[PDB]
RNA sequence: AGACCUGAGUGUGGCAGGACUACCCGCCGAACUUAAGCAUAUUACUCAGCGGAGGAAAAGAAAACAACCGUGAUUCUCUCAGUGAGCGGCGAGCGAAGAGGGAACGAACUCGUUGCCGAAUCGGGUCUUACAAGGCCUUGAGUUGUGGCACAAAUAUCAU
RNA sequence: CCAAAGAAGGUGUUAGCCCAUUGAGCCAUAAACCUGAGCGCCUCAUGAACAAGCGAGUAGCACUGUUUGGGAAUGCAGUGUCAAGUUGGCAGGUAUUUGUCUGCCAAAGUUAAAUACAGAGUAGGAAGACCGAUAGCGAACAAGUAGCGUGAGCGA
């Protein structure tokens, strides 16, 4: 764990600020939020296989079957409100299409 | 005190300095700053120019702690030095050290003649202040 | 555990199987009363999350609230005053339907203490919430350290004062800092602080 | 007439005045001396009740946040578990011998950690721990002479054992360095300032 | 705030041959139709009813307070100013009057009275004693029934020694560490008769300072 | 026959109901007024109306500030600040927050989850001077999960 | 003559010594309270050393209404639509698409103090540069009374 870059001791600059002996960022219980969740993913996969697809997912999968993937992204963005969520949903549907073929 | 007010001198006057013709009515010109663009425009325009309109950008959520930057000049630097240290201070020798951020200042400006040479620790400085204090036998040390 | 599977199953609410279950349930609920006592919660995972325990003294009631916006109850839609306060149909209640259901349950059954509630179903005209209630006179409740607090008098009709989760939601206590500065501890308290005229003794 | 006066913005157009028909919105301080007396009497009563323990629990020394105040020091909410561990104390046990603990506070530097570790060391050196049983005294527990000679701190900040918060000492007078007579401090500071002021535009120009 | 305004009290109008002041509503009473809601009407509301927001207390600069106390102390040492303020000091040995600290060990009011007779403050004490009387107005109907003159003020170095002096009528007790201007210049008049203990006298230079120190 | 699911009747043991309502919590909510007119605005997130607690109430243990050399639940005070914030027929008017000095403060805990257990749990009888945080019994309730142990102030617990 | 008591009430005029008061103290106590977490006994507890998860019609988002200093939206409500969790989410006060950084981890719950009492009570106190019987509460008095109104109410 690299020690942080020391400050320069002046009020302006790239590493401006009073000079102290900086300590590294200590581990936190919240650090486990970025770790992959294998059991949660397995439970979600079982539930998804059990229940099937939602109407949004069916519409996006048909959009992806034909060449229109930008329109699938637009539809996802309209339904979800966020571009990151739309891209995640489109990627999940692409992976589901690949899994269905294979 | 009520005994010093004009109400006591006007006992028996029946008008209290407001006249028989005009009288003292409730609100004869509106309430507050009413009519600053009509029927009080002369007053507003000759006594408070610039009142109406818009100017400049908008700084949403202005925190004034980040902008804190008091200034001190070169001829005022003896306020931050004890008398005995200024007694011994001289060019080419041991000089008192002034910490501006601990004394309450951020920038050294440099107007006038510096009375006592010293080493000034300052966050900011002017070019004229830096040059003048270096000529006078002192110095500036940047701090944060 | 099984909780993970039930939780994911209830997160998949738009699937075919859950839509079928919810349609049958909405029909069955539509053909019942406004307030219905249940032996067991329809969603045990959600009930246990919100505070329900399968112990003596815990009760579940399903409460039904009609859907849609508020109508101002002015005669013939006639309002007098400025045209600003003239809308009769486009106004909205400043309190959510979950809070309304909790308050209806608590006002109907005054011997119980309302703890929480959760959404179970909704159709084109109705919305159903399951409300958890606790009996303050039960020995199991009065001797359990984790539900003991509800026996005290400050918790009488907390749902009517908006101290439940839905009450906090519509009061704005879901937010902190610069998002709820004028809403804390309450908007009335902030208004009092900001508007009271202060007269220091020596001034 | 009106004449030349400041434009008034007195802000009294609400129903603050208590009259007939109006409850009012006012706050008078006529109970200020009585409340000061009550607070002092309650503090003395609490000190008598919690005798011989210090009235105020031990608190750390912290730096004030913004750049306007970062040169100032004050008392924190409590000692971090890192500082307690460095001083050799369990946080849960320290919470029982009158030490405030703060799990939220992070130590981003060694100086502010060392000052608080020194505070903890001084407090634990001056601490007198009464035995649970005076007949069987365990390790690290006071004897009967220390128990009988105990005294209460009763200080406003609870810092008689460790003193007030320490500040950096003033630099002694010295001579100007040869590099200090020649270096252009304004040029150095302006170069450093402009490096950040025009970082994005310089990078864009270099890329294009 | 409700006083004088706790009525319906609407105005009758102008068609009836009466003034337009609001009149009390109803009938069957002597108060019906009586004028209400006015400083001139009987049972009405006073002009500008008094509030508790009035500025009762004042801020005085610390240096100005210290200057006032210092001036009162300086004036207390001039025998002619003390004489002109009203005190009977025609037999006291010296002004400023400084006595030994052995009076702090007195346990009996008769010992205190003997000391007062010895140092000849008994003339001023008798002055206030003879001056005691009943107040001359509504103050005695309030809790201000009796009045008397001021008399000497005995200053002690600390809080001890007042046991024999607390019950003497016409003698005030003071602590050198906390000197009050309302007692050094009663009524705003400088030249109070002050009896110093030796220790209180020697504390004065350190308490108030010097022109240079 | 029987079960258990859903729902009744009765017995037995309880509780709710009204008053108060200064303050406090939730809703609902004007207008006169001011803008020298008036419709946005203002009055005012106020009066009146309808609920609900308590000696206080509410809030409260960071999905917090910040941008520091950083701080550290809530509440309150002075200050910030009638603001070179902002909002506004940018008019009349309106209008906060962080930081700082303080008050207070032994201030923190509980559940769901996840692991590992799994009825060890709860009522009810009866006994112990005991409607015991105890023993014994009990299908009565509960396995559609009550209870235990460990989750950062942490690094096992469980024996003997 | 008394004063460790001068305290201001009463008594046929203006009372330290006529009376009551003005102090150490003394006596008596359901429970609670406080006191080596006072102290025994029985009983019952109990301390120290001998890998995965983390709160879903939720958070968003759209439209509408409202609220806010919050402004390409500060909160909230209705309805539609509806996540992530293996660039994990949320905040960082100019909307967008990026990618860096910082702080934090929502959608169960409990919690004392410092704070209010702006027309409340209960049991007490201290008062006042206040009012002084057309005043001060409507009410110094068998006053919310007598009286008045179908009544809500009004009210000496
Ligand atoms: K409706
Ligand atoms: K209308
Ligand atoms: K605040
Ligand atoms: K002053
Ligand atoms: K007008
Ligand atoms: K408003
Ligand atoms: K502070
Ligand atoms: K008397
Ligand atoms: K991040
Ligand atoms: K709470
Ligand atoms: K309050
Ligand atoms: K009260
Ligand atoms: Mg005049
Ligand atoms: Mg005129
Ligand atoms: Mg509404
Ligand atoms: Mg709050
Ligand atoms: Mg012990
Ligand atoms: Mg009156
Ligand atoms: Mg007279
Ligand atoms: Mg109201
Ligand atoms: Mg309190
Ligand atoms: Mg509370
Ligand atoms: Mg406003
Ligand atoms: Mg459990
Ligand atoms: Mg013990
Ligand atoms: Mg014992
Ligand atoms: Mg939603
Ligand atoms: Mg508005
Ligand atoms: Mg607004
Ligand atoms: Mg969470
Ligand atoms: Mg007084
Ligand atoms: Mg009369
Ligand atoms: Mg009267
Ligand atoms: Mg009357
Ligand atoms: Na006189
Ligand atoms: Na009630
Ligand atoms: Na503060
Ligand atoms: Na006395």
PDB file of N, CA, C and O (backbone and C1' of nucleotides) in Angstrom, chain B residues 28-35 38 51-54 58-59 61-66 101, chain F residues 33-36 66-67 69 80-81 83-87 90-93 96-99:
ATOM      1  N   UNK B  28     -48.825  58.213   3.189  1.00  0.00           N
ATOM      2  CA  UNK B  28     -49.103  59.123   2.089  1.00  0.00           C
ATOM      3  C   UNK B  28     -48.230  58.890   0.863  1.00  0.00           C
ATOM      4  O   UNK B  28     -48.495  59.487  -0.185  1.00  0.00           O
ATOM      5  N   UNK B  29     -47.205  58.038   0.960  1.00  0.00           N
ATOM      6  CA  UNK B  29     -46.293  57.803  -0.155  1.00  0.00           C
ATOM      7  C   UNK B  29     -46.068  56.318  -0.412  1.00  0.00           C
ATOM      8  O   UNK B  29     -45.117  55.956  -1.110  1.00  0.00           O
ATOM      9  N   UNK B  30     -46.918  55.453   0.127  1.00  0.00           N
ATOM     10  CA  UNK B  30     -46.711  54.026   0.015  1.00  0.00           C
ATOM     11  C   UNK B  30     -46.013  53.465   1.233  1.00  0.00           C
ATOM     12  O   UNK B  30     -45.724  54.159   2.211  1.00  0.00           O
ATOM     13  N   UNK B  31     -45.738  52.167   1.174  1.00  0.00           N
ATOM     14  CA  UNK B  31     -45.092  51.460   2.270  1.00  0.00           C
ATOM     15  C   UNK B  31     -43.709  50.991   1.846  1.00  0.00           C
ATOM     16  O   UNK B  31     -43.566  50.296   0.836  1.00  0.00           O
ATOM     17  N   UNK B  32     -42.701  51.370   2.623  1.00  0.00           N
ATOM     18  CA  UNK B  32     -41.355  50.884   2.368  1.00  0.00           C
ATOM     19  C   UNK B  32     -40.745  51.555   1.156  1.00  0.00           C
ATOM     20  O   UNK B  32     -40.793  52.779   1.004  1.00  0.00           O
ATOM     21  N   UNK B  33     -40.159  50.741   0.278  1.00  0.00           N
ATOM     22  CA  UNK B  33     -39.496  51.215  -0.930  1.00  0.00           C
ATOM     23  C   UNK B  33     -40.432  51.253  -2.128  1.00  0.00           C
ATOM     24  O   UNK B  33     -39.980  51.094  -3.269  1.00  0.00           O
ATOM     25  N   UNK B  34     -41.726  51.446  -1.896  1.00  0.00           N
ATOM     26  CA  UNK B  34     -42.693  51.483  -2.982  1.00  0.00           C
ATOM     27  C   UNK B  34     -42.429  52.665  -3.904  1.00  0.00           C
ATOM     28  O   UNK B  34     -42.106  53.768  -3.454  1.00  0.00           O
ATOM     29  N   UNK B  35     -42.573  52.430  -5.204  1.00  0.00           N
ATOM     30  CA  UNK B  35     -42.460  53.502  -6.168  1.00  0.00           C
ATOM     31  C   UNK B  35     -41.056  53.971  -6.452  1.00  0.00           C
ATOM     32  O   UNK B  35     -40.862  55.139  -6.792  1.00  0.00           O
ATOM     33  N   UNK B  38     -41.207  54.951  -9.961  1.00  0.00           N
ATOM     34  CA  UNK B  38     -42.214  55.950 -10.289  1.00  0.00           C
ATOM     35  C   UNK B  38     -42.658  56.638  -9.010  1.00  0.00           C
ATOM     36  O   UNK B  38     -43.133  55.977  -8.084  1.00  0.00           O
ATOM     37  N   UNK B  51     -29.096  50.808  -8.172  1.00  0.00           N
ATOM     38  CA  UNK B  51     -29.947  49.935  -7.371  1.00  0.00           C
ATOM     39  C   UNK B  51     -30.621  48.861  -8.217  1.00  0.00           C
ATOM     40  O   UNK B  51     -30.717  47.703  -7.795  1.00  0.00           O
ATOM     41  N   UNK B  52     -31.092  49.217  -9.406  1.00  0.00           N
ATOM     42  CA  UNK B  52     -31.919  48.334 -10.215  1.00  0.00           C
ATOM     43  C   UNK B  52     -31.090  47.656 -11.296  1.00  0.00           C
ATOM     44  O   UNK B  52     -30.264  48.294 -11.950  1.00  0.00           O
ATOM     45  N   UNK B  53     -31.308  46.356 -11.476  1.00  0.00           N
ATOM     46  CA  UNK B  53     -30.703  45.628 -12.567  1.00  0.00           C
ATOM     47  C   UNK B  53     -29.972  44.401 -12.085  1.00  0.00           C
ATOM     48  O   UNK B  53     -30.120  43.959 -10.941  1.00  0.00           O
ATOM     49  N   UNK B  54     -29.165  43.837 -12.979  1.00  0.00           N
ATOM     50  CA  UNK B  54     -28.380  42.642 -12.716  1.00  0.00           C
ATOM     51  C   UNK B  54     -26.952  42.881 -13.185  1.00  0.00           C
ATOM     52  O   UNK B  54     -26.704  43.671 -14.098  1.00  0.00           O
ATOM     53  N   UNK B  58     -23.263  34.217 -11.106  1.00  0.00           N
ATOM     54  CA  UNK B  58     -23.864  33.702  -9.886  1.00  0.00           C
ATOM     55  C   UNK B  58     -22.968  32.618  -9.309  1.00  0.00           C
ATOM     56  O   UNK B  58     -22.602  31.670 -10.011  1.00  0.00           O
ATOM     57  N   UNK B  59     -22.622  32.757  -8.035  1.00  0.00           N
ATOM     58  CA  UNK B  59     -21.767  31.812  -7.326  1.00  0.00           C
ATOM     59  C   UNK B  59     -22.659  31.065  -6.340  1.00  0.00           C
ATOM     60  O   UNK B  59     -22.820  31.475  -5.190  1.00  0.00           O
ATOM     61  N   UNK B  61     -23.756  28.529  -3.607  1.00  0.00           N
ATOM     62  CA  UNK B  61     -23.086  27.977  -2.433  1.00  0.00           C
ATOM     63  C   UNK B  61     -21.694  28.592  -2.258  1.00  0.00           C
ATOM     64  O   UNK B  61     -20.664  27.928  -2.366  1.00  0.00           O
ATOM     65  N   UNK B  62     -21.691  29.888  -1.945  1.00  0.00           N
ATOM     66  CA  UNK B  62     -20.409  30.593  -1.719  1.00  0.00           C
ATOM     67  C   UNK B  62     -19.943  30.320  -0.292  1.00  0.00           C
ATOM     68  O   UNK B  62     -20.643  30.745   0.646  1.00  0.00           O
ATOM     69  N   UNK B  63     -18.831  29.607  -0.138  1.00  0.00           N
ATOM     70  CA  UNK B  63     -18.250  29.411   1.210  1.00  0.00           C
ATOM     71  C   UNK B  63     -17.141  30.461   1.330  1.00  0.00           C
ATOM     72  O   UNK B  63     -16.301  30.518   0.416  1.00  0.00           O
ATOM     73  N   UNK B  64     -17.154  31.275   2.386  1.00  0.00           N
ATOM     74  CA  UNK B  64     -16.181  32.393   2.495  1.00  0.00           C
ATOM     75  C   UNK B  64     -14.898  31.938   3.201  1.00  0.00           C
ATOM     76  O   UNK B  64     -13.917  32.702   3.178  1.00  0.00           O
ATOM     77  N   UNK B  65     -14.904  30.753   3.809  1.00  0.00           N
ATOM     78  CA  UNK B  65     -13.663  30.208   4.428  1.00  0.00           C
ATOM     79  C   UNK B  65     -12.639  29.927   3.322  1.00  0.00           C
ATOM     80  O   UNK B  65     -11.487  30.358   3.487  1.00  0.00           O
ATOM     81  N   UNK B  66     -12.967  29.223   2.215  1.00  0.00           N
ATOM     82  CA  UNK B  66     -12.023  29.061   1.114  1.00  0.00           C
ATOM     83  C   UNK B  66     -11.444  30.357   0.556  1.00  0.00           C
ATOM     84  O   UNK B  66     -10.300  30.325   0.072  1.00  0.00           O
ATOM     85  N   UNK B 101       0.101  33.775   8.914  1.00  0.00           N
ATOM     86  CA  UNK B 101      -1.131  33.008   9.073  1.00  0.00           C
ATOM     87  C   UNK B 101      -1.488  32.825  10.542  1.00  0.00           C
ATOM     88  O   UNK B 101      -2.673  32.728  10.881  1.00  0.00           O
TER      89      UNK B 101
ATOM     90  P     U F  33     -57.273  44.916   1.908  1.00  0.00           P
ATOM     91  O5'   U F  33     -55.845  44.673   2.602  1.00  0.00           O
ATOM     92  C5'   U F  33     -55.507  45.444   3.778  1.00  0.00           C
ATOM     93  C4'   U F  33     -54.134  45.045   4.251  1.00  0.00           C
ATOM     94  C3'   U F  33     -52.972  45.456   3.345  1.00  0.00           C
ATOM     95  O3'   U F  33     -52.633  46.825   3.510  1.00  0.00           O
ATOM     96  C1'   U F  33     -52.678  43.225   4.045  1.00  0.00           C
ATOM     97  P     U F  34     -52.502  47.788   2.234  1.00  0.00           P
ATOM     98  O5'   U F  34     -50.979  47.554   1.785  1.00  0.00           O
ATOM     99  C5'   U F  34     -49.953  47.503   2.802  1.00  0.00           C
ATOM    100  C4'   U F  34     -48.708  46.901   2.206  1.00  0.00           C
ATOM    101  C3'   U F  34     -48.441  47.240   0.738  1.00  0.00           C
ATOM    102  O3'   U F  34     -47.895  48.540   0.571  1.00  0.00           O
ATOM    103  C1'   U F  34     -48.130  44.938   1.074  1.00  0.00           C
ATOM    104  P     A F  35     -48.390  49.480  -0.632  1.00  0.00           P
ATOM    105  O5'   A F  35     -47.755  48.767  -1.926  1.00  0.00           O
ATOM    106  C5'   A F  35     -46.318  48.774  -2.082  1.00  0.00           C
ATOM    107  C4'   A F  35     -45.910  47.723  -3.083  1.00  0.00           C
ATOM    108  C3'   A F  35     -46.285  47.991  -4.542  1.00  0.00           C
ATOM    109  O3'   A F  35     -45.318  48.835  -5.148  1.00  0.00           O
ATOM    110  C1'   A F  35     -46.764  45.728  -3.961  1.00  0.00           C
ATOM    111  P     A F  36     -45.684  49.746  -6.418  1.00  0.00           P
ATOM    112  O5'   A F  36     -47.019  50.522  -5.978  1.00  0.00           O
ATOM    113  C5'   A F  36     -46.896  51.726  -5.187  1.00  0.00           C
ATOM    114  C4'   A F  36     -48.022  51.759  -4.185  1.00  0.00           C
ATOM    115  C3'   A F  36     -49.440  51.681  -4.774  1.00  0.00           C
ATOM    116  O3'   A F  36     -50.190  50.642  -4.159  1.00  0.00           O
ATOM    117  C1'   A F  36     -49.274  53.455  -3.219  1.00  0.00           C
ATOM    118  P     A F  66     -19.914  21.930   3.130  1.00  0.00           P
ATOM    119  O5'   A F  66     -18.560  22.503   3.780  1.00  0.00           O
ATOM    120  C5'   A F  66     -17.381  22.614   2.949  1.00  0.00           C
ATOM    121  C4'   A F  66     -16.310  21.699   3.487  1.00  0.00           C
ATOM    122  C3'   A F  66     -15.061  21.539   2.620  1.00  0.00           C
ATOM    123  O3'   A F  66     -14.091  22.527   2.930  1.00  0.00           O
ATOM    124  C1'   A F  66     -15.813  19.413   3.405  1.00  0.00           C
ATOM    125  P     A F  67     -13.838  23.774   1.956  1.00  0.00           P
ATOM    126  O5'   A F  67     -12.303  23.587   1.520  1.00  0.00           O
ATOM    127  C5'   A F  67     -11.447  22.761   2.342  1.00  0.00           C
ATOM    128  C4'   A F  67     -10.899  21.622   1.519  1.00  0.00           C
ATOM    129  C3'   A F  67     -10.249  21.999   0.179  1.00  0.00           C
ATOM    130  O3'   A F  67      -8.932  21.472   0.102  1.00  0.00           O
ATOM    131  C1'   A F  67     -11.743  20.194  -0.092  1.00  0.00           C
ATOM    132  P     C F  69      -3.593  21.279   4.179  1.00  0.00           P
ATOM    133  O5'   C F  69      -3.411  19.883   4.962  1.00  0.00           O
ATOM    134  C5'   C F  69      -2.100  19.532   5.464  1.00  0.00           C
ATOM    135  C4'   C F  69      -2.198  18.984   6.867  1.00  0.00           C
ATOM    136  C3'   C F  69      -3.605  18.815   7.456  1.00  0.00           C
ATOM    137  O3'   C F  69      -3.603  17.821   8.469  1.00  0.00           O
ATOM    138  C1'   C F  69      -2.462  20.463   8.671  1.00  0.00           C
ATOM    139  P     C F  80     -22.253  37.805  12.171  1.00  0.00           P
ATOM    140  O5'   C F  80     -21.921  36.859  10.917  1.00  0.00           O
ATOM    141  C5'   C F  80     -20.558  36.429  10.707  1.00  0.00           C
ATOM    142  C4'   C F  80     -20.570  35.078  10.039  1.00  0.00           C
ATOM    143  C3'   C F  80     -21.369  34.994   8.737  1.00  0.00           C
ATOM    144  O3'   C F  80     -20.591  35.418   7.629  1.00  0.00           O
ATOM    145  C1'   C F  80     -21.882  33.140  10.128  1.00  0.00           C
ATOM    146  P     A F  81     -21.187  36.465   6.571  1.00  0.00           P
ATOM    147  O5'   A F  81     -22.029  37.430   7.532  1.00  0.00           O
ATOM    148  C5'   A F  81     -22.686  38.575   6.949  1.00  0.00           C
ATOM    149  C4'   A F  81     -24.136  38.561   7.357  1.00  0.00           C
ATOM    150  C3'   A F  81     -24.413  38.619   8.866  1.00  0.00           C
ATOM    151  O3'   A F  81     -25.408  39.588   9.161  1.00  0.00           O
ATOM    152  C1'   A F  81     -25.615  36.856   7.880  1.00  0.00           C
ATOM    153  P     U F  83     -27.385  42.812   3.607  1.00  0.00           P
ATOM    154  O5'   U F  83     -26.204  41.821   3.173  1.00  0.00           O
ATOM    155  C5'   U F  83     -25.048  41.705   4.030  1.00  0.00           C
ATOM    156  C4'   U F  83     -24.451  40.329   3.871  1.00  0.00           C
ATOM    157  C3'   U F  83     -24.302  39.815   2.430  1.00  0.00           C
ATOM    158  O3'   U F  83     -23.025  39.214   2.269  1.00  0.00           O
ATOM    159  C1'   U F  83     -25.391  38.213   3.722  1.00  0.00           C
ATOM    160  P     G F  84     -21.743  40.081   1.844  1.00  0.00           P
ATOM    161  O5'   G F  84     -21.925  40.126   0.255  1.00  0.00           O
ATOM    162  C5'   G F  84     -22.449  41.330  -0.337  1.00  0.00           C
ATOM    163  C4'   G F  84     -22.328  41.231  -1.834  1.00  0.00           C
ATOM    164  C3'   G F  84     -21.777  39.904  -2.371  1.00  0.00           C
ATOM    165  O3'   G F  84     -22.473  39.510  -3.547  1.00  0.00           O
ATOM    166  C1'   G F  84     -20.371  41.690  -3.039  1.00  0.00           C
ATOM    167  P     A F  85     -23.838  38.665  -3.463  1.00  0.00           P
ATOM    168  O5'   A F  85     -23.324  37.162  -3.186  1.00  0.00           O
ATOM    169  C5'   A F  85     -23.764  36.489  -1.984  1.00  0.00           C
ATOM    170  C4'   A F  85     -23.634  34.999  -2.171  1.00  0.00           C
ATOM    171  C3'   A F  85     -24.631  34.359  -3.144  1.00  0.00           C
ATOM    172  O3'   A F  85     -24.068  34.269  -4.443  1.00  0.00           O
ATOM    173  C1'   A F  85     -24.769  33.276  -1.046  1.00  0.00           C
ATOM    174  P     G F  86     -24.883  34.770  -5.729  1.00  0.00           P
ATOM    175  O5'   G F  86     -25.724  33.462  -6.144  1.00  0.00           O
ATOM    176  C5'   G F  86     -27.113  33.619  -6.514  1.00  0.00           C
ATOM    177  C4'   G F  86     -27.971  32.735  -5.645  1.00  0.00           C
ATOM    178  C3'   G F  86     -29.482  32.940  -5.777  1.00  0.00           C
ATOM    179  O3'   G F  86     -30.014  32.162  -6.842  1.00  0.00           O
ATOM    180  C1'   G F  86     -28.881  33.021  -3.496  1.00  0.00           C
ATOM    181  P     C F  87     -30.654  32.863  -8.135  1.00  0.00           P
ATOM    182  O5'   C F  87     -32.232  32.772  -7.841  1.00  0.00           O
ATOM    183  C5'   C F  87     -32.740  31.635  -7.103  1.00  0.00           C
ATOM    184  C4'   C F  87     -33.951  32.060  -6.313  1.00  0.00           C
ATOM    185  C3'   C F  87     -34.882  33.063  -6.999  1.00  0.00           C
ATOM    186  O3'   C F  87     -35.755  32.434  -7.928  1.00  0.00           O
ATOM    187  C1'   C F  87     -34.532  33.686  -4.736  1.00  0.00           C
ATOM    188  P     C F  90     -39.313  41.371 -13.955  1.00  0.00           P
ATOM    189  O5'   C F  90     -38.612  41.824 -12.585  1.00  0.00           O
ATOM    190  C5'   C F  90     -37.639  40.938 -11.992  1.00  0.00           C
ATOM    191  C4'   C F  90     -36.876  41.677 -10.926  1.00  0.00           C
ATOM    192  C3'   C F  90     -35.690  42.510 -11.413  1.00  0.00           C
ATOM    193  O3'   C F  90     -35.310  43.425 -10.396  1.00  0.00           O
ATOM    194  C1'   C F  90     -34.875  40.678 -10.251  1.00  0.00           C
ATOM    195  P     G F  91     -35.077  44.983 -10.703  1.00  0.00           P
ATOM    196  O5'   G F  91     -36.334  45.689  -9.994  1.00  0.00           O
ATOM    197  C5'   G F  91     -36.676  45.321  -8.636  1.00  0.00           C
ATOM    198  C4'   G F  91     -38.110  45.710  -8.379  1.00  0.00           C
ATOM    199  C3'   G F  91     -38.586  45.677  -6.926  1.00  0.00           C
ATOM    200  O3'   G F  91     -38.264  46.875  -6.234  1.00  0.00           O
ATOM    201  C1'   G F  91     -40.228  44.728  -8.388  1.00  0.00           C
ATOM    202  P     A F  92     -37.717  46.840  -4.724  1.00  0.00           P
ATOM    203  O5'   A F  92     -39.034  46.658  -3.819  1.00  0.00           O
ATOM    204  C5'   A F  92     -40.090  47.646  -3.900  1.00  0.00           C
ATOM    205  C4'   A F  92     -41.329  47.093  -3.243  1.00  0.00           C
ATOM    206  C3'   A F  92     -41.098  46.309  -1.948  1.00  0.00           C
ATOM    207  O3'   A F  92     -41.071  47.165  -0.816  1.00  0.00           O
ATOM    208  C1'   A F  92     -42.412  45.016  -3.414  1.00  0.00           C
ATOM    209  P     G F  93     -39.964  46.961   0.326  1.00  0.00           P
ATOM    210  O5'   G F  93     -40.528  45.705   1.155  1.00  0.00           O
ATOM    211  C5'   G F  93     -39.642  44.593   1.424  1.00  0.00           C
ATOM    212  C4'   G F  93     -40.266  43.328   0.891  1.00  0.00           C
ATOM    213  C3'   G F  93     -39.649  42.013   1.373  1.00  0.00           C
ATOM    214  O3'   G F  93     -40.131  41.621   2.650  1.00  0.00           O
ATOM    215  C1'   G F  93     -39.829  41.956  -0.954  1.00  0.00           C
ATOM    216  P     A F  96     -33.624  32.219   6.717  1.00  0.00           P
ATOM    217  O5'   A F  96     -32.062  31.994   7.027  1.00  0.00           O
ATOM    218  C5'   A F  96     -31.630  30.713   7.548  1.00  0.00           C
ATOM    219  C4'   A F  96     -31.309  29.773   6.411  1.00  0.00           C
ATOM    220  C3'   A F  96     -30.006  28.982   6.542  1.00  0.00           C
ATOM    221  O3'   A F  96     -30.150  27.855   7.392  1.00  0.00           O
ATOM    222  C1'   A F  96     -30.159  29.877   4.375  1.00  0.00           C
ATOM    223  P     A F  97     -29.166  27.651   8.643  1.00  0.00           P
ATOM    224  O5'   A F  97     -27.995  26.738   8.029  1.00  0.00           O
ATOM    225  C5'   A F  97     -28.353  25.652   7.145  1.00  0.00           C
ATOM    226  C4'   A F  97     -27.157  25.282   6.305  1.00  0.00           C
ATOM    227  C3'   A F  97     -25.812  25.233   7.034  1.00  0.00           C
ATOM    228  O3'   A F  97     -25.617  23.990   7.691  1.00  0.00           O
ATOM    229  C1'   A F  97     -25.583  26.479   5.045  1.00  0.00           C
ATOM    230  P     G F  98     -24.827  23.917   9.086  1.00  0.00           P
ATOM    231  O5'   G F  98     -23.284  23.882   8.627  1.00  0.00           O
ATOM    232  C5'   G F  98     -22.830  22.764   7.836  1.00  0.00           C
ATOM    233  C4'   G F  98     -21.477  23.060   7.239  1.00  0.00           C
ATOM    234  C3'   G F  98     -20.351  23.452   8.195  1.00  0.00           C
ATOM    235  O3'   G F  98     -19.860  22.384   8.992  1.00  0.00           O
ATOM    236  C1'   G F  98     -20.215  24.702   6.202  1.00  0.00           C
ATOM    237  P     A F  99     -19.422  22.633  10.517  1.00  0.00           P
ATOM    238  O5'   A F  99     -18.176  23.650  10.423  1.00  0.00           O
ATOM    239  C5'   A F  99     -16.916  23.183   9.886  1.00  0.00           C
ATOM    240  C4'   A F  99     -16.007  24.364   9.652  1.00  0.00           C
ATOM    241  C3'   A F  99     -15.611  25.169  10.892  1.00  0.00           C
ATOM    242  O3'   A F  99     -14.516  24.582  11.580  1.00  0.00           O
ATOM    243  C1'   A F  99     -16.378  26.643   9.242  1.00  0.00           C
TER     244        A F  99
END
